[PDB]
Structures are given as structure tokens and as C-alpha cells.
Ligand binder design. Sequence first.
Ligand SMILES: *[C@@H]1O[C@H](CO)[C@@H](O[C@@H]2O[C@H](CO)[C@@H](O[C@@H]3O[C@H](CO)[C@@H](O)[C@H](O)[C@@H]3O)[C@H](O)[C@H]2NC(C)=O)[C@H](O)[C@H]1NC(C)=O
Ligand SMILES: *[C@@H]1O[C@H](CO[C@@H]2O[C@@H](C)[C@@H](O)[C@@H](O)[C@@H]2O)[C@@H](O[C@@H]2O[C@H](CO)[C@@H](O)[C@H](O)[C@H]2NC(C)=O)[C@H](O)[C@H]1NC(C)=O
Ligand SMILES: *[C@@H]1O[C@H](CO)[C@@H](O)[C@H](O)[C@H]1NC(C)=O
Ligand SMILES: [Mn+2]
Length: 503
Amino acid sequence: SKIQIQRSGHLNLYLLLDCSQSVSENDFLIFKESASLMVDRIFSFEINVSVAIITFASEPKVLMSVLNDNSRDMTEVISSLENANYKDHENGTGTNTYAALNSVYLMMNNQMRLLGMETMAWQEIRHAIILLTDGKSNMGGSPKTAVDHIREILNINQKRNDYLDIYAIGVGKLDVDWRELNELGSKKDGERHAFILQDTKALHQVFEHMLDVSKLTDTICGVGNMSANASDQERTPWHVTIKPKSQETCRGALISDQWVLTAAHCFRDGNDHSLWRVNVGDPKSQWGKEFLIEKAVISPGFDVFAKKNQGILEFYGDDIALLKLAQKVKMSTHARPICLPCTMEANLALRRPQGSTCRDHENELLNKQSVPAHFVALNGSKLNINLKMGVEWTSCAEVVSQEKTMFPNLTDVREVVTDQFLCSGTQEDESPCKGESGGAVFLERRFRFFQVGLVSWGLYNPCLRKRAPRSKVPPPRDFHINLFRMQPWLRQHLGDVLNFLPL
Ligand SMILES: *[C@@H]1O[C@H](CO)[C@@H](O[C@@H]2O[C@H](CO)[C@@H](O[C@@H]3O[C@H](CO)[C@@H](O)[C@H](O)[C@@H]3O)[C@H](O)[C@H]2NC(C)=O)[C@H](O)[C@H]1NC(C)=O
Ligand SMILES: *[C@@H]1O[C@H](CO[C@@H]2O[C@@H](C)[C@@H](O)[C@@H](O)[C@@H]2O)[C@@H](O[C@@H]2O[C@H](CO)[C@@H](O)[C@H](O)[C@H]2NC(C)=O)[C@H](O)[C@H]1NC(C)=O
Ligand SMILES: *[C@@H]1O[C@H](CO)[C@@H](O)[C@H](O)[C@H]1NC(C)=O
Ligand SMILES: [Mn+2]
């Protein structure tokens, strides 16, 4: 009933953009913006996908054909779309949707001819057509007739139901013809295939629900669900709960199908890992699934009382741990590894050049003096922070000299906050609670998720679903272990787990 995101076979996606005079010039820019979002998203899954781009009024115009190998190149698809001009159809501003759909038919006929009707290269292709239109066809005859023709060539019935989806979406400040939208994108079973949406934000939500990713079960990193209607676990599937002996909880992140990344300070009782449990996401229950631990590696530099002779009562240098789960996790919508920077996995996720390095990844991901990021709350919800970098890191970390509990003897901030920590908590940031520690601090780029740090400590615990700030000294401020500073140790233990880039 949905567009299938999977490794096997091939996806042909046809984007048909209504460029007729009932679509204003600005309405068309909204269409181009929606198309670009669907292209960027469909490519984020690293599946085999070709994209055709057609604009249409009285005549259709093919900017990209699936017969062009360039339609598998996200770069060339996006440029051909951005090259699309409203005035391209100035000589025929009517609305001939049939002609636009027939253009897709002729495309299919030609590729089937190319590859060969009887070949698997042709049989394996799934076809998804999305029309961005206000639905007001007024020439060429019935779009349904061209849809019948497409369904004929593709051999669609109940069995081969999954090889064609047609969607018709009106996005923007349009006068939409609803009846016509529904003729174009009729229902498959119960699944809606016609939508009227106010803007590209609504489209982005709706497109998430058009994509079936349940069959995507390999270890692809940093894939999430960005619908509000998805569960918390589906939105952050790397996210895990950690249960030490101490009965207190921590959070952590799946970084492969068997390894979890978390905070060292979570394990106060010591190093007896056989009493610890991890809850990873699971489709069958919101409780998740409990795993035991095969082995634990706590950073050898971690020791909360290391600086206690200097009157510093808690020191969180090297606050990091790796847990190997007793079994491999089964990858699913509720359980995926997050992307770790400085790996080939993360380099592909970012669509970067081959010979990138760790420095490159740091530079791309932590690209500003204030970098918007997230951590996941106790209730599973996604919370917002701004990582303070370069010159702003110093003034961010400065307020720890006002801490009254942890450090009664502190003549030097850089004895407690070293270069090992990212910093947030200023302005209107959320601050992690103690139970949220160990959890990923992560960014989103190109629709993929990247762990740049982990929750370690802060000056103010809001949980001391329910949360509270205040307005007195010292101010909230939070310090996260920076994964870019932990590379040597991570490589020592994950070198045969992930493929690390040159430094
Ligand atoms: C983002 O998350 C949403 C919410 O889970 C995903 O939509 C869901 O997609 C699944 C997979 O096909 C649908 O499963 C079907 O459920 C119906 C019951 O209503 C059942 O009859 C079928 O047997 C099948 O199991 C599910 O309906 C659907 N849920 C909603 C609210 O639409 C979406 O696919 C996810 N997208 C991405 C990009 O990860
Ligand atoms: C819009 O049409 C004009 C005019 O084209 C002429 O009249 C049309 C109705 C049609 O019958 C054409 O065959 C005629 O040529 C186009 O302007 C022409 O562009 C061509 C090729 O680019 C060029 O050789 C001429 O200078 C132009 N002809 C005249 C007489 O103006 C214009 O390109 C069309 N707009 C499009 C399709 O973007
Ligand atoms: C989860 O906690 C956040 C953090 O304050 C809160 O905003 C959100 O409403 C909570 N979700 C609920 C109430 O289930
Ligand atoms: Mn029109």
C-alpha cells in the first residue's frame, strides 16, 4: 500500500510538477521545494533509486529520464530540478495531466524496451509516481486513461500490487480540486494516496508516512522516522536504556548491531557487567527487548575522584564506555545503529568524497560556533540544545567556577572542563537529567543522524515528563563527552566493527 524502501530490486520515482497557469509562480517554487525534499529523502536510505523529473502544463517537459543513468545521481537530479523554470511552459499554460502521465508511460515503455520485458532488471523495478498539482486538469482527456495504460504495461493486479504507487498532492496556497486529486491518486486498500497540505513542512511529515521501511533490515546507520505520529523509538532507534546493578538508569546508543556506547559514570558499583542489562528498541513491544552484556570496556582514564586531592570531588574526564551485547540485535524500525563520525559508514551517510578524514567530518558536522543538536529525554522525547564551539565554548564553560557542591576548591576551570567536552545549556536549551546520561548527543544532516557526543554531567538536574528551570547561580550548563576527542580509544575497540577513516 506504500512506497517500499528496501535493498532488493530498484525504485523508479517519477516527480510530475504542475506548471500550468493555475499554479502561480510562487506556488511552483513550493512544488520545486517539495520535490527536492522527496529526492533528498529517498536518497538518504542508500537504496537503488532512479528519479525522473517532469514539469507539465499543456505539454509535459522531461528534465530527467530514468533512461538517463544520471537519474541515479542525487546531484544531477537536484540540479535538473533547480534548472526547472516556470516560464518553460509559457506557450501552453493549460493543464493536460493525461499528457504528463503519458510521458511517464512512454518512459516506461522505452526502459522496458531497453532492459527487456523478460529480464529481472526490468521485472525488479518498482514504480512510484507523485504529481504535485492542484488537480484541475482541463485538457487532453482523462488522466485515468493514462493510469490504466501505465497499469497495463506494468502488469498491475493484486499480486503485483506493490510495483506501482500513484500519489497526487496539492501543497501550498492552492485552490485544489479534491475530487480530481482522488481520481489521480486513488486509494490502495486503505492507504490514502491523495493529499492537500499547507506547506513543505506538512509534506515532509506526510512523505514519511508514504514510505514503508519495514523491510530495510541491514545495519544502515542513522536512519530515523521524522513523523510526529511515529513512536519515540522509531524516531530515535539507536536509543537504549541501561540498567546497572545500582538500580539507577542510564541511556546509551547502538553504534553497531552488537555494541552500545554510553557513559562510564553509569557503572559505579564497578566492573561486574553480568549484572547489567540493556533494553534496545523492539517493534513487538514498547518495553523494548532486554539484552545481557558479553563484555564491557570502561575507558581506562575514567576515575570520578582522580582530582580529589585538588579539592575536586567529581571529575568526568574519559567518561565513556563500550558494551558488547551477548547477542546481535535484529535491525528494524525500532532498532538501528546511529552513525559515528569518522567512519566510512558516516561518510556515505553524508554523501562525502572517498578520501575524507576525521578532521573533515568534525569540520562538516560541528561547522558553526553554535551548533543545534539533540538528546533524548527519559520519556523518550527528543530535546533541543545548542553546542557552543570555538571562542564561544570558553564563555559557555566559564560558569562552572560558580558551582558550590562539586568543587569547593577550584582555581582553574580547565581542571574540570577540558577539551574532551562539548558544552550547551545556555539561553533556552534543555538540560539533561542524571538518568539521561550516557545517551547520545546527536545532529541531523542530509536526513541522517550522527552522534557527536554523549551526556556526561551538568550543573543543574531538572528532574531533581516533568522538568523545571530556575533563575539563580550557578546557571544550567551541560558537558558532553566529545566523540571527536575519543578516537584512539574508540578505534582500539571498534576497529573491526566499523571502518574508520584516516585521522
Ligand atoms: C514512520 O513511522 C510510521 C508509523 O509507524 C510508519 O507508518 C507505518 O508504516 C507501517 C509499515 O507498513 C504500517 O504498517 C501497517 O499497519 C497496518 C495497521 O494499521 C496493518 O494493516 C499492516 O499489516 C501494516 O502492519 C503502518 O500502518 C504505518 N502507520 C501509520 C500511522 O501510518 C512509516 O512508514 C514510517 N516511515 C519511515 C520513513 O520510517
Ligand atoms: C514559445 O514559442 C515561441 C515562438 O515559436 C514559434 O511559434 C510557436 C507557436 C511554434 O509554432 C514554433 O514552432 C515557432 O517557432 C518560441 O520562440 C522561438 O524559439 C525558437 C527556438 O528556441 C527560435 O528559433 C525562435 O527565435 C523563436 N520563434 C519566434 C518566431 O519567436 C519560444 O521558444 C517558445 N517558448 C518555449 C517553448 O520555451
Ligand atoms: C516528555 O518530556 C518532555 C520534556 O519536558 C515534555 O515536554 C513532554 O511533554 C513529555 N512527553 C509526555 C508528556 O509524554
Ligand atoms: Mn492548471
